[PDB]
Scaffold this active site. Structure first.
Site, PDB file in Angstrom:
ATOM      1  N   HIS A 292       8.539  59.080  40.244  1.00 46.16           N
ATOM      2  CA  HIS A 292       8.010  60.327  39.682  1.00 46.16           C
ATOM      3  C   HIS A 292       7.454  61.298  40.726  1.00 46.16           C
ATOM      4  CE1 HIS A 292       3.955  58.234  39.478  1.00 46.16           C
ATOM      5  NE2 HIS A 292       3.608  59.425  39.928  1.00 46.16           N
ATOM      6  N   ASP A 348       9.950  53.114  38.037  1.00 42.67           N
ATOM      7  CA  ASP A 348       9.383  54.271  38.670  1.00 42.67           C
ATOM      8  C   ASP A 348       9.041  53.938  40.120  1.00 42.67           C
ATOM      9  OD1 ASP A 348       8.013  56.621  39.176  1.00 42.67           O
ATOM     10  OD2 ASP A 348       6.268  56.095  37.954  1.00 42.67           O
ATOM     11  N   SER A 454      -1.307  58.499  43.172  1.00 45.13           N
ATOM     12  CA  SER A 454      -0.082  58.350  42.418  1.00 45.13           C
ATOM     13  C   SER A 454       1.017  57.713  43.293  1.00 45.13           C
ATOM     14  CB  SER A 454       0.367  59.678  41.856  1.00 45.13           C
ATOM     15  OG  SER A 454       1.124  59.447  40.692  1.00 45.13           O
TER      16      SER A 454
END
Ligand SMILES: *[C@@H]1O[C@H](CO)[C@@H](O)[C@H](O)[C@H]1NC(C)=O
Ligand SMILES: *[C@@H]1O[C@H](CO)[C@@H](O)[C@H](O)[C@H]1NC(C)=O
Ligand SMILES: *[C@@H]1O[C@H](CO)[C@@H](O)[C@H](O)[C@H]1NC(C)=O
Length: 508
Positions: A292, A348, A454
């Protein structure tokens, strides 16, 4: 005549339903959907989102460009869902609602209860297309035989035509090669038996996996920190990890010690100057992050090699640390082929090569990646992990209107949540490829869940051999939204044979 074509059409359409032929049965009698369900012959009158299907023979509201005289195959009758044009969205229908021409319907999938064991190692089906619907190349073909024998395979695994197979013991499952660069490939979508790594049970000494040539150096000596393990010095909160069964106070996130997380990477935007995501460093040459961070369409994101830069050995978020940090460009970016954001952030994960191998220092050292065995072992004996970062996760996914981003790399330890407890906690579907973490919210057992960067690391230290292992990649988690919930982490124990193939597309 067409009547004999119809019989064969059904057959070819049901090609991917095999082992139970009570499954091939259930396919051929079209009551459920196989693949893009061009086999579907059922009577679902209604689209996925509520609306009555239009009659195929009708022209109100919509005048179909697909009618029984253009697609006499497909049983375009009454107003039942069909897939006359092979939509990658499956069996659909025209809508009685003048504002929606087409919508997919919600059709039960054929074989749902059936389940493939052992990551497709005994798969003998005829599935011949990857997850992005890219057709398999034949194994026979010139490159895959008279040139790729050095990477040898298990020959209990029969390679037949161009069917997805798992020859190299790949924990991700069966795969096949695809059209493009030499060695290009993809994973195929079989329905694997859910296998929760935490409840696996039945490693001795450390033993290495990839070559000091293409994965590069570092693997042999991963997981030991120059400033800590190698100086046999203990860090301020690693004891919580080794004593993870003890019901402790709750040591909040604090500033990291210098050199405490030397595999920490920052993914960084060239222009504007911007901290994008986190990542970890797994060899002199490779970087692990979440997919992502490079490709995420709902946010209209799509970076390429030339937009970004990594920064390695940083401690301060903002200052350029000139004696210490190496700051590298990217040769290639590899989004995991299985990666999907349409349903919910599945696989991901993304690999990244550096244009030039970085030199290990006191502050730059690679973390270890575990395999299934080791990963399982670690989870059996360890109940908390560590997430280090610059609070990029909180700054990316929430308004953060609170206090601001920290100014130094933060360390915190977090409990690992039991799979079922984590399942009930969220609306989202936690596969066996994910795990939750964070404290189970009491008022004497508080909640600050949205921790780390992240796509950054979540790590555990081995009580068997003292090395640090990366056990997941931080992804978005419900804990960033709702005060009661957990952090979500993408498992990594399945990645070795994928990395393997990625590095094999090289030679020097
Ligand atoms: C669905 O189609 C069947 C087949 O005739 C019918 O009995 C039923 O009432 C139909 N409902 C809708 C919404 O089309
Ligand atoms: C089916 O629709 C096509 C699409 O334009 C139309 O031209 C045609 O008249 C229809 N077919 C037949 C055989 O009448
Ligand atoms: C994003 O951009 C690249 C480079 O222009 C392009 O090749 C690719 O098609 C785009 N990504 C996706 C998922 O379509």
């Amino acid at each position: 005549s067409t009547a004999t074509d119809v019989f064969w059409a059904k057959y070819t359409a049901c090609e991917t339903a095999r082992t139970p032929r009570d499954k091939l049965a259930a396919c051929l009698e079209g009551n459920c959907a196989e693949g893009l369900g061009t086999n579907y012959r059922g009577h679902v009158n209604i689209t996925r989102s509520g609306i009555e299907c239009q009659l195929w023979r009708s022209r109100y509201p919509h005048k179909p460009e697909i009618n029984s005289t253009t697609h006499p195959g497909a049983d375009l009758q009454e107003n039942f869902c069909r897939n006359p044009d092979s939509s990658t969205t499956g069996p659909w229908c025209y809508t009685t609602d003048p504002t929606v021409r087409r919508q997919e319907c919600s059709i039960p999938v054929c074989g749902q209860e059936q389940c493939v064991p052992d990551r497709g190692q005994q798969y003998q089906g005829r599935l011949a297309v990857t997850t992005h619907g890219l057709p398999c190349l034949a194994w026979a073909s010139a490159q895959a035989k008279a040139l790729s024998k050095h990477q040898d395979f298990n020959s209990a695994v029969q390679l037949v035509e161009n069917f997805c197979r798992n020859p190299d013991g790949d924990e991700e499952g069966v795969w096949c090669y695809v059209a493009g660069k030499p060695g290009d490939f993809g994973y195929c979508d079989l329905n694997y038996c859910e296998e929760a790594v935490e409840e696996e049970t039945g490693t001795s000494e450390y033993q290495t996996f990839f070559n000091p040539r293409t994965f590069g150096s570092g693997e042999a000596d991963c997981g030991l920190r120059p400033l800590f393990e190698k100086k046999s010095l203990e860090d301020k909160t690693e004891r919580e990890l080794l004593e993870s069964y003890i019901d402790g106070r709750i040591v909040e996130g604090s500033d990291a010690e210098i050199g405490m997380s030397p595999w920490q990477v920052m993914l960084f935007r060239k222009s504007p100057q911007e901290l994008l995501c986190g990542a970890s460093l797994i060899s002199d040459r490779w970087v692990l992050t979440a997919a992502h961070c490079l490709l995420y369409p709902p946010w209209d994101k799509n970076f390429t090699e030339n937009d970004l830069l990594v920064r390695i050995g940083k401690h301060s978020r903002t200052r350029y640390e000139r004696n210490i940090e190496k700051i590298s460009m990217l040769e290639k970016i590899y989004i995991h082929p299985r990666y999907n954001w349409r349903e919910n952030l599945d696989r991901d994960i993304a690999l990244m090569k550096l244009k030039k191998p970085v030199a290990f220092s006191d502050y730059i050292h690679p973390v270890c990646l575990p395999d299934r065995e080791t990963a399982a072992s670690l989870l059996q004996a360890g109940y908390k992990g560590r997430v280090t970062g610059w609070g990029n996760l909180k700054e990316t996914w929430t308004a953060n209107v609170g206090k601001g981003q920290p100014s130094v790399l933060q360390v915190v330890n977090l409990p690992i949540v039991e799979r079922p407890v984590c399942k009930d906690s969220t609306r989202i579907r936690i596969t066996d490829n994910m795990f939750c973490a964070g404290y189970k919210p009491d008022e004497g057992k508080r909640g600050d869940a949205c921790e780390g960067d992240s796509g950054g690391p979540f790590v555990m230290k081995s009580p068997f051999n003292n090395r640090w292992y990366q056990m997941g990649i931080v992804s978005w988690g419900e804990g960033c939204d709702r005060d009661g919930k957990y952090g979500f982490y993408t498992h990594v124990f399945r990645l070795k044979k994928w990395i393997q193939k990625v590095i094999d597309q090289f030679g020097e």
